[model samples]
Target: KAKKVRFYRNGDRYFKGIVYAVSSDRFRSFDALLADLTRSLSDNINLPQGVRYIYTIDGSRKIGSMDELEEGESYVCSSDNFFDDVEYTKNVNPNWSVNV
Candidate 1:
């Protein structure tokens, strides 16, 4: 089944997010989805040259395959590790109470 997955960069300010139609049948692995993202959003997003990884919006789970992702779920893409980066968390989870 085709799932609508939202993608966003870790520290992107101007770019809010983008939803891509994905399916496990087509993208069997995370690498396949990554390549598609690079080809599709390279001009808009700042995708690094080296290795990149995708994770849940909370950065708690490292999605290894397309099957792990769910429909209407948001994800983040970054070259750096998504362990304990305060900046990434802040960017992904924006708080309206705090001034930008």
Candidate 2:
């Protein structure tokens, strides 16, 4: 395997997403994402009070909530790929679980 692309999941924790298969637009960091969200909220919550959202840790890795890896497993690099494999697995094998 020249590029052994292994697939592993930490737990049942998952995030639903659709990556740009081939996008021309640049990407934005999660901190900027948080800033956008905060701005949207403050448009009401902090109106006339201009509040700032401090995202000292928000990144592609920092989800806003806690998600435990209830179960997980990995397979050798020999197939297609994905990010949230648990969720994707659930989509196909609704009853199957990653009992790692």
Candidate 3:
């Protein structure tokens, strides 16, 4: 799989083409977590409010759909309407991070 989109970045922003998160789960294996994240990103991401979403696979985020990224690697992504423009419509959790 070849990626159709190519990216270049400037100050304050960078393009990594990969998506990875911290690996410190005490229950499931790394592979399982990665798979779960991929499934969740796919099934959960709706991309409304002008937000386009790209996700990473287990260990690899977005390696041109062909590259194999390692576990805990990182990735960057953007969309047509959600890149630089943002409007706060609500603050449902004004005093957020209830646990924190």
Candidate 4:
């Protein structure tokens, strides 16, 4: 239902989004995502503090901690559709000029 509405409104579709790093938004690496967490009085105890929440904007379940985030997948991509397929076009004789 959501897919149909999105297509009718925008005339295209995309895949389900994977998990991503959110919160502070200053991470140079995935390990840096734990910058806001702190260690407890017990040397082995790592507790959350001032940590920015990591979430999926696609409305998936939230990850409770940073450690669980490494188990997920995420990525960034170019917004320009230079290489995207012509899923739907109004051109009568569209010439495909895409490059790898």
Candidate 5:
């Protein structure tokens, strides 16, 4: 796959096109992608509000079509409304951690 999941830190405040996290540079497993981001999630560092959202492009998506990302594709995230404005409203989620 020539695509990868992209991650952005979305909030009610200022945001940018810069990617905060990623599934992988190259193709990787979903489990691996999950592990990479969940590694000791920090609030003081990358996330200040301690809350954010996870939105996916999935080969080209908008707010209505937004969906969970796959592990084998490259995607970009943008906080600016110009990208996917309603995404933040629809895809909002708290900083998550899977306890296993």
Candidate 6:
């Protein structure tokens, strides 16, 4: 089955807060999938020098394999871990209050 995943980069102002779709066939390795995503994004966006990782949208998990991703879910592509960057935390919804 073909799966479509949503991807966006941090601080991607040119895309105006929009996520792009990446479609792929099932059973592909994570490395292969990332290569495709890299090429696709580079075609449209002026990517930075080292965007080599993918993480869940909420920045809670690093996606190590295609099996770790779900169809139609949103993800982030970056050179480093999302949470490690201070700017990413600004993307969180201010109204969201979590219970500890």
Q: Pick the candidate with the highest TM-score.
A: 1
Local lDDT at 51 for model 6: 50
Off by over 4 Å in 6: 13-28, 43-46, 83-100
**Tens digit of per-residue lDDT, candidate 4, span 1-100:** 0000010001122332222334334444433643422110112221113222333223244444434443234311211222223242233663223110
lDDT, residue 45, model 1: 43
Task: List residue ranges in candidate 4 displaced over 4 A.
Answer: 1-51, 70-72, 75-100
The most accurate candidate by lDDT is 1
The lDDT values for all models are 0.65, 0.23, 0.29, 0.27, 0.35, 0.55
In model 1, where do residues sit more than 4 Å from their true spots? 43-45, 83-100
Q: How many pairs of residues collide in each model?
A: 0, 2, 4, 0, 5, 0
| C-alpha lDDT of candidate 2 relative to the true structure | 0.23
On residues 1-100, what C-alpha lDDT tens digit does candidate 1 reach at each position? 5777777676665565677778767676768778877665455446665337777877788777777878777777776676333343234565233110
TM-score (all chains, Cα) for each model: 0.69, 0.21, 0.22, 0.22, 0.30, 0.60
User: Clash pairs of candidate 4?
Assistant: none
Give the alpha carbon lDDT tens digit for every residue of 2-69 in model 5: 32333444332233222233324532554454344444333344444332233444324533222355
State the weakest 10-residue window (summed lDDT) of model 2.
Answer: 15-24
Candidate order by lDDT, decreasing, is 1, 6, 5, 3, 4, 2
* Candidate 2 TM-score versus the reference: 0.21
**Candidate with the larger TM-score of 1 and 6:** 1
Model 2: runs farther than 4 Å from truth?
Answer: 1-27, 44-100
lDDT of 4 at 63: 43
TM-score between model 5 and native: 0.30
